[PDB]
Structure formats: C-alpha cells, structure tokens
Ligand binder design. Sequence first.
Ligand SMILES: OC[C@H]1O[C@H](OC[C@H]2O[C@@H](O)[C@@H](O)[C@@H](O)[C@@H]2O)[C@H](O)[C@@H](O)[C@H]1O
Ligand SMILES: [Ca+2]
Length: 140
Amino acid sequence: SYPKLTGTVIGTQGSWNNIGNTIHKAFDGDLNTFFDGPTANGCWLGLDFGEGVRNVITQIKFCPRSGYEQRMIGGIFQGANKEDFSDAVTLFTITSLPGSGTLTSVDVDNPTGFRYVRYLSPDGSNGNIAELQFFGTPAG
Ligand SMILES: OC[C@H]1O[C@H](OC[C@H]2O[C@@H](O)[C@@H](O)[C@@H](O)[C@@H]2O)[C@H](O)[C@@H](O)[C@H]1O
Ligand SMILES: [Ca+2]
C-alpha cells in the first residue's frame, strides 16, 4: 500500500453556472463536494506532480458526485509526461456504475513514471466527480 500522491491541481477552468464547484472540489477530502464543470463535454482534472517529478501509479480512487454516479461511466484515467496529454496512456476505464458516497479503488499495473495524471470525463458528464486520488511511488 503506497502513499497518496500530491501535486498541483490542473484541468478545466470554471464551474457550472459559476457557482464555484471547480476542479479543486475533487481534492478537498469531502465526498459531499464535487466538480461540476462549466460545459457538458470536454471536462477533465488531474495533477501535475511538478517538473522533474515522476510517479509510478499503483492505485486510483474516486467517488462520483452523489446522485450523478452514472456521469462517470466511460470516464478514463490517463498518465502522461506532456501537459497536453498527447503521449498519454489510459490507466483505467470506468465501465460500471461507481458506488455512491465512497471511494472506489482500482489497481493500476503500468510501470511508467508520469509527471501528469488526469480523469477525462465522458460526454454529458460536466466532468462530475466528487473526489479523486492517486497513489504510487517515485519512479526509480
Ligand atoms: O447540465 C449540467 C447540470 O445538470 C444538473 O442540472 C440539470 C438541470 O436541472 C434542471 O432541473 C434545472 O435546475 C437547470 O438549472 C439545469 O439545467 C446538475 O444538477 C447541475 O449541477 C449540472 O451538472
Ligand atoms: Ca470533494
């Protein structure tokens, strides 16, 4: 069991109806708060571990927005070493409805060290997700 990774929060700017449910609500430790993106499609969020830092990801945990769990199905998690994700690989694809109000934990088996990781939400989701966590270890 590896430590929770920290980094700078990156992703889609803004929030639905400018209420303020920005990407940062997915990293605040509260499963009742959530990211509600300004648009239906294209929303994403993640971390930049910082220049020169690469982690190997061994687990991802996430919790859907309460009452909108189906807006995660089809979302994917990617690791990359370019901030535009053009070199990304998909670490996990959500294909089952995530349980409400808890962190679903998924193992990742990819030995690559990444500087960047994200959740890329499916169309019609407004990026909805309540909490997102990555675990792993410094690439050796
Ligand atoms: O469409 C993104 C939006 O979906 C839900 O709100 C949908 C609509 O709900 C209606 O009943 C009205 O209240 C209207 O304001 C909305 O267009 C989510 O509740 C909302 O957070 C957002 O994710
Ligand atoms: Ca939250």
